[model samples]
Target chain A: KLVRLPGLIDVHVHLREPGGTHKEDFASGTAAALAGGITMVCAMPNTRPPIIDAPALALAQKLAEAGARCDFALFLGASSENAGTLGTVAGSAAGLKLYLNETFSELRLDSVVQWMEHFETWPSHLPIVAHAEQQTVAAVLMVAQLTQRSVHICHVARKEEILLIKAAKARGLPVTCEVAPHHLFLSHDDLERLGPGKGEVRPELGSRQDVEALWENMAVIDCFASDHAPHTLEEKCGSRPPPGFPGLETMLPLLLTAVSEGWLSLDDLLQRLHHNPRRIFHLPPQEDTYVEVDLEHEWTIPSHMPFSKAHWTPFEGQKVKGTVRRVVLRGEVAYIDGQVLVPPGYGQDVRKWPQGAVPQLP
Target chain B: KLVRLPGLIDVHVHLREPGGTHKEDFASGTAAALAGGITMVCAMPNTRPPIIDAPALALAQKLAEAGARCDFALFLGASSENAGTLGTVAGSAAGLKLYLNETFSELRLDSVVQWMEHFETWPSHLPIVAHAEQQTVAAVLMVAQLTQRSVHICHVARKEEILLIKAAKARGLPVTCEVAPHHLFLSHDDLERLGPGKGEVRPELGSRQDVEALWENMAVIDCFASDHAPHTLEEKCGSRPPPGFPGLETMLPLLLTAVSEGWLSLDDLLQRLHHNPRRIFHLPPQEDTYVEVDLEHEWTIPSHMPFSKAHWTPFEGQKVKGTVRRVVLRGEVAYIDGQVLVPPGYGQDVRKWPQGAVPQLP
Candidate 1:
């Protein structure tokens, strides 16, 4: 085999359902995942109706069952109305995803804190993903440190945050961070150079110094997730475009290319995208989520070839020096030699946090 | 008429000529100008075999003549090999594009004083477009003040440089600076987010705060230019992807959208895209090179619709509230109602600088 590894489970994904189906629906988003070598993706709950309860999760599950191409999972949102539902989806989801700051123009810091407190007895040991940013990250870090709650920071966009994450972990505070490929590579200045064509959740790209810092801190961060949020180019251009990129398709290739360019290695990539994610979320070894690439294949990025409906990617047309030769998702082959073979309902939903403890198996 | 400003003239552009055809050749790059509502574009010289000597300029002209869809001019690279030929090309070009820093791996910055000394005596008074990053902007400002030479800083990619250009001008130095659209709209953060996609040029996207500073200083910066280096998406993803976007097409619309959103004003856009570019370069305006739009017409962005061969833009599918209704270039209608019509031989080689001793006529 050119390269071989275990299957992957992405726990932070936005399918744009219930409210913004035009940008991305479950069917379309899952199709994109299959194209990108993903076996299971946990859909975010920031939808129209908002998947903050069991009914919402059930609805999302029904939709995924009918159309999602790969296995699926759901992370319930922290809402006052649905805070009680944490018990419903708890142990059924990989973890709880909460906006520790104002994300989606909703959830104030106070409300976010209250929501976190609402899940007071989250099986006493379940991990929680914190979308930390600006003041919010600071506030949550203070509380998380005191409470001794295992915290996973989502999309560390700022260089300052990277250091903060490292410092927190070094201090024995239960803190972990995640770095998107975008944050690792782009800076605000590059965005200024390229201008509007480059839009995402975090509008500005950080500086060269910031990128260098990200590369330096790669070791302390947790696994990489595509955070694949899909949207049509038209929608992105229209009045108010949500910030995100359909990254699943480009994730492996982009990271692999980074390795090819000597920035990291296959071990680093696999650690971030595979081994770490599984261990962090306590996912059992699956058949075809992990993949092997031929490392020497040279391929040009084709336009509009997304695994998700949000077909736009910042990495369109980029060339990576490797290819995924085989993908193992839940103990079976899902993607191999550019073809996907997993049946739509092959894998089951992962609905719980990692069993046992922190640094689960790493 | 529904829309009535003559098509825009972009004096700051990089068509990637004399060799780096894989990135952007004259033919493909010019076609991009036509689609962008641009009637006139100045092609900068920093190619594989840079357009330094007179023979190279002639060759570039021949190629543009045979295939360009828009009127064009050339900017000579301020390299030691072509020091003598700088004045020769200045007879027909907007100005000399000086690489004030060691950007993009090559392109030396050794002959600032020598080039400055030679350019001070020209009757035609060619303006020097200094690619003034922070470090070099200060250096060039010093050279301009010392030599009493008229110059325009190109790609003021940082706030410090923009401020320096402003201060230099305020202190009576005839130094002006051009802000690449990217530098104005994107922050360094984008580089981190977009990573490899942001592998072009120096002073790569700065921080969001840095980007905000650039926007604040846009008032003092000179006209806007695409520096439109059109590398095929394939070529762009190679070990060293060239930094630039196909701006001629996307520039206007994106600005119009930005203006509509109140990020800037119509006047600001006009100053950067039209008035200042025309005045600073001594490139006399032709009969018709203006584009007209409602300034309120809403439209959507589409992918793969670029007029350039390197059919990719960082601002793919960004919608603007305003759209160009018509484009006229030198007594000819080059584009109108989402279509282009610049016939062969219609776009003349730049004669504005060639006419000699640019008569001061407002």
Candidate 2:
């Protein structure tokens, strides 16, 4: 019943610290991540004041240094004004994040000039993580093709978006995309269960057709990201509720359910969740990082999360097959059963690894 | 509003001659094809007594020569006993069709050895058109890989099947596949409207998810074939109704509807219906062959077909855009307005083309 694998890396999570820590802080987010078998998480740039420059990345890195329970890196937000200077932090930051589509953030760039500046200057070696939805998906690829930069689109939700990426890859554009677990498993039809306010998300839940298309085009999809933007139940139910879900702990179980039902293979999950993310984001390998799962463990998703402070899920009450039983990161036990054994500050900044170095084992 | 294009080629069709002519024959099937803007159709070999040997192909060819109103080619059926000798007819036939699934014909190959011999001996230049469904799709790809031969899979209908083909193509396998118009547009959910008996089809109508996948992966699909196996209304509704739908007359308008709605583009349609089919089947350049269509025309599908003896349609009442206005084939006005202008003996067997010949237009 036990299936062990390399540590999973989630490249599109919103820790919501510095500004929105009321929902989830570095400690809780990373704890939930470890509980879900992820040993590394690349935090999104949309936070209080937004991580738009070296100082912001510095501040966020300090918070993660003090509070994160697993290996992590912070993304530097891309703004029209900061586009030219953003490369200064490329060695330390995960990637340059571009908010092209509307999201729960003020870092959105509207003008083509804004996109052009970022696409033009971002270090070609560092990936550009774009929050570009359907039409913007095409725009991002076009801008990347024109600028000759590599871009990784986040949370491709529609059939058109994935297919467009497929076509781009076919013609050898340095383009890749990730799909969130929520987009793959839920759809507009689930709005009834999720409720009007809870159902809302950036790049809103697409039709059953879109969800199916995403699954069908898995080969074209580069990674399986959580985009786990956690928010409290009260805030999510409030009139001015922001769109997102706490997915850090549920992604693996849900994907495991898909595997159990033959929708996906084990290698498919590993490749997207572990292999591709590391290669695309250019992270160094850890010596001994792995997650052990009880493949036969069947459980219904609970109303509140095990480690995330944001005690809500769109997947509430849904039955799932596998569960993360234990985790080892960097030759140490970080999580066991349902508990995070590592304290805050136990995490390392993965980018701090010697360039292209694989950690030596004890 | 008129759009003119190269003559369409449907490489998968069942004319039902030599045994099942009670449903459709060469004259009626070819007439239906012309009315739908197709100048050539490679007829499948799943006839009453399937076309297996040179004599069988000769009989089918003689029928098309005298009764067909459009250019055509016959596929040679590959059976367990004829695997070693099937190549003798490759010069006269379009391709070797191997049925690996349950179908109306008794040509299903059950033994892997049966598949191996065909894969081993069939002329590599003549494509092997396999009627392989989901699992069989993988098997065919494996056999072809081991045998190091090229294959053309007919009527890819499932998400898994299409993705498998996508993976094979990405890895440089000399494999190709076609998606039927019915499969791309219709689904199992339509059974209520189609009635249980008429809803039956080999590689039966897939789920809406599967249909969406085919459209989403159009780049991977090599051709748009009709799988035009027509049966009369009584036969379709009778006890133990045969599996198939009359698709010749509906494929263009249906795909045109997709084009108008932006699901498909002119290039996508032209490539799958004409360019790819020609290249895959080694069809020669046709002189002055084209179809003129009113791209803006919109009409509801009718119960009775315009030319085929099959009087009913599963697509009845569906609204579609575009209509064929005129057709020119081999430098002659073959069809105009609503009538086929050519006589029964007008069609030239595409196989009869001089090797590497292109007819000169005058």
Candidate 3:
């Protein structure tokens, strides 16, 4: 069964650049995403020198432009230092990301007033993404409700967080959430089974019920983002291994499995992966973009031969149906049959085009 | 900080009687209920000679009349043999229980038509409780939706199941579900921690995420049932140990802990434990019956001192606040300071009285 879907968009990925590329860089991460049927990745802003200020954002764009093989956009990290000055870089980036929870970079907002200041200063039209967990989930939703502004919660793991978001949305608060594949499929059991370093992730893997709740409340979620924050095996196994998983290559296979199993519908998948991402991130649509999946293709997720430079998957060894066969980016072959046909720098930032403008590619 | 609440009702319990007394009987199980400040218990029929007909129903009522210390009711198990003859004993039993999943007795309906037969034949006013999981949860809701009959789901453990029930309620399908303390508090991690024998339970323990989901969607749920299925420690340690937990004694402490933690509200607890059970089960409310609690009292749940003859708890050593100080049954001190003041045979069947008749339980 061949299923062709509009090119999926992942609003969350960590392409470490300008300093840290040992784990993942623009070219490889973008290529990995294309292989997974993702044509656009709105990368998280927690890299070396992090995309906090205008100069840093420009540096990220340069890096993505030079190496990315697919369409891409950069998110500006919400720093306490940048709390009062968000208007300067409004349309230059895809959105703003606030780390309400712990993060390796200097994005974690410490003071309460800083959170309010950021929420107040940031333009209401552009996205203000929050890496918020349970209590922080409550806090951010309250901020959104009070400011009467829109907020997108990133990678909600627990029912405590998601249900709260569900209520906020019900009350007409302009808030949305995303569920990562890891948080959707894996639990603390996986964390325990994978041992210390490899299994560890920020906000941690939730329990089985939380995963089930996320799936159950699928309509409440706005998009599916990889939060593809990768770390190399050496760094992961080391004493101070950072948290996150290499998700660019595994998101589609895992989600397709979800659809085959009947918990997920193809419609919901399209909404979360493509429609919602483009809408939420305010990224322009490509003129011709789609990905083809062979629904009958059964394969084991390998620990090796991955496009991700990290070279391993938390989803390793899991048997999955529905493989990504070909990805067409703006009517051109970007990735097909386990290979990257497009070269580095072929990618264009969707943010570079004016909002609602369709891109023209030869 | 003292608090007084109506004698809580446990709509689901497995008191082995007229068959497997070594694990628990009407005497011990009902006594356990009183000690836990639960004044009423509705038992599931899955014994050697399960409650399916008038004879078994009479025997169960006789057993409760002779040995039960708490007010009681018995659920007549829906069977392949009795599906067509449901109207024979109209109000003799509390409700009809359909085991859509695996059970130890001959109660599991094998034929799809048998389910429809029971649903159609069963009285509309009487409660039809289902031991339904995810797919079966969907099945039973469809049954009720088609038949326009009311149904109560027992011990819902997964978000997949509960959220479906939530939707059924939203669409007004006349469906309700009870969540067990085991499902609410413990996850599969606890199952692995407790090991094979002791950890085994019907529906099995869900992941940490499942427990969190149950708690987060607490409002969607109709009631909190103990599903107080007890098994002897020796039986649990044996090779073919039954899947169940002795939950009567732990139900309150676990839920009280939930209340103390701020997720559960006092009003919701009242509705689930007292008001809703009385309404759904059609069990007459007791006059002047209440239980007092010391909100500040804290203690560890002991494995051995449980009133349940199973002599163990899934929640052993759990530090919980809010202790059951005293129980006032019909304006009399039925239980106080960890002692059962009520005698055997004192508990009356709530269904014994005519409809809407105030119980002269003096």
Candidate 4:
């Protein structure tokens, strides 16, 4: 009998909708998501017109219902002024994503103390996701300690940041984190080899030592996410180019290649991709959902192979040993062999957090 | 009326000539060197046709004598097959530069033991410069212990590499090393900020921790050399661009800025630029050599300011504090303000090593 794995869930993705459709919309982004064998994703809220209030959340839901090809969840952006509005729809969204520092959105909170104060008001039951880099990790963990709210740090990139997160998890501060594939496999050496304006990613790629540290401390890391931001080739090549790249299509292939190369096992891959994301995000499991992959299929990623409107990826020309052959979203074949098998409106909204607590790790 | 400092000596530079003259030649290179207040330079032998033998040495001497604008000494490349020839010119050249790992030249030695055997045959007094990265640092230090010869490690860039060198120095092995300005100032974060190829250099810039390690372990570091490799903008922007960037013109400015920023002392700057280089290389002192500078003349580095034929520098647009007003080479003013004061052939050849022993540091 052939082997199969449960459909992977990426709790971090950015499907630009309501605004910034030139880079990506719900339809194109979700198609790219299914092609990577990701059956479900929690879309980040740093879009052009960010999801800061209930109206923005409702509009995002409407757009997702009209165009998404797979299961979809959405996060509400946490700004300094949106603390009141956030409480209004606290249970409606999947989780709260706070931009501790200024990134693509201008909705950044001021200082460590200022953001820590905001964390004091977060709902205790729901997870609070963060885009905390460098020193912000310590601040986030400190707030989690004070507020007693579970915090999940996004895109942990540096060695010091990893050690801090490890120490926090060891102390039982309810801290968890996700490491993007770009940070895991790439380094500054890659940027040097690729040339200017190329390999420009947010939270930036780290050093060889930092990347090695990330792989070595995989036990403390809670999950793996794409942080799948998209931008057009023209915007990327232009001056004052925006940070981030299309990772939704290449995420699983990169992880599977690591498995094929013996750095990780299939069980380790499933733990980070399927089990941990579901547990940390409190998502319901669909029994019939699975992703069929050809582990032996070796190929090179094309220069512009992304199904998203961005149509470019930083992992271009990279060699990989595994690929998604088909994706089954809740018992229906949604994508197969570089083709989208489902219609635009096939996906259902994941409107509420699952009722059960997170599954305990062995 | 003006600030006066000892004329700088760079033990590492590449004057691409006899071949690849389009990139840099002896005249243009020394002109740039003088403009940056470098009165003496030890040119590397990794040119198109490398200086691996006696005839090449004589030819380089002839060319430099005909066109150089400052005192110059050349290094003999050490290949696996050139060990016998390296012994013949041990004292005739500045030092034997062995590429344990390949950079621009194909003169790399195969294994640790293989190169260690060559070290056994070296003359006791002259230093054997090495381009050892990562684990090669340990191998080089171990071989220096076994072979009882002094080794000069070039461009120490990693934390582990620095710790190894510090241990070797503490154990009293004759291990001298140089840290390039690029390694001291830039990091992987810079590469991320600049994007690919833009920040590329050999002994690639490491993490922030690695750079901090280099600064913290400055007590063990022997000297600061420019490793002033040059290439035209066309070549740098081409498909197969070279690995290094021009540093001769920016090296002093960078160090001066470091002093102004209180990160380094003026005394430490002089020790690295003038004192240690002269002592380690065993070069004669130029009694009347000095550079007059306006330490408070702050300005941004222009994109097209280099006098080298390569006509490009990585430090372009960098804010700098000090500016050299006049360069006195030997007893003559070689360069002043934006002009070359001497004719192309006015400088003399540094044909012999000093007869005295190296000065011991406190």
Task: Give the top-scoring candidate (TM-score).
Answer: 2
How far does residue A156 in candidate 4 sit from its true spot (Å)?
A: 0.7
Clash number for model 1? Answer: 85
User: Following a full C-alpha superposition, what root-mean-square deviation does model 1 have from the true structure?
Assistant: 26.1
- lDDT winner between 1 and 4, please give it: 4
TM-score of chain A of 2: 0.97
Model 2 segments more than 4 A misplaced: A356-362, B1-140, B144-167, B170-362
For residues A1-362, write the lDDT of model 4, one tens digit per residue: 22366678889998888789999888899999999989888899988679988888889888988899988788888887776557667766778898886567778788676667667775665768999899888977888877756689999989989988876654435677999999998899888765566677778889999999998887667789999889898888889677887888999999989988878666567768876676567665554677878888899988877598888777888999888888887678888899998888888776542322221111
What are the RMSD figures for all models against the true structure?
Answer: 26.1, 20.5, 22.0, 26.4
Q: Give a tens-digit lDDT track for model 2, residues A69-165.
A: 9998888888768878865577688888899878898986879888988878876556788988878888877888888667899989999898888
Runs in model 4 deviating more than 4 A are A352-362, B1-362
lDDT of 4 by residue, B1-362 (tens): 45667678899999887787898888988888888889999999988678888888889888888888898888888767776656666667888888888577888777776687668776655668999999988888788878866789998999999888877654446677999999987888787654566566788889999999988877667689989888888877778777887888888888888888877666467668776776567655564678887788889988766597767766677899988899887688888898998887877667552322221111
- The 10-residue segment of model 1 chain A with minimum total lDDT is A353-362
Model with the higher lDDT, candidate 1 or 2: 2
Ranking by TM-score: 2, 3, 4, 1
Shares of reference contacts reproduced by the candidates, in order, are 0.00, 0.00, 0.00, 0.00
Put down candidate 3 lDDT per residue, B62-103, tens digits, no spaces. 888998888888889888888768676755687889998885
Evaluated on chain B only, what is the TM-score of candidate 2? 0.96
**lDDT (10s digit) by residue, model 2, range B236-352:** 899989899999999999998898897865656876887678656766546667788888888999987788888888999999988889989888998888899999989978887
> How many pairs of residues in model 2 come into backbone collision?
0
Q: What lDDT does the true structure give each of the candidates?
A: 0.64, 0.83, 0.79, 0.79
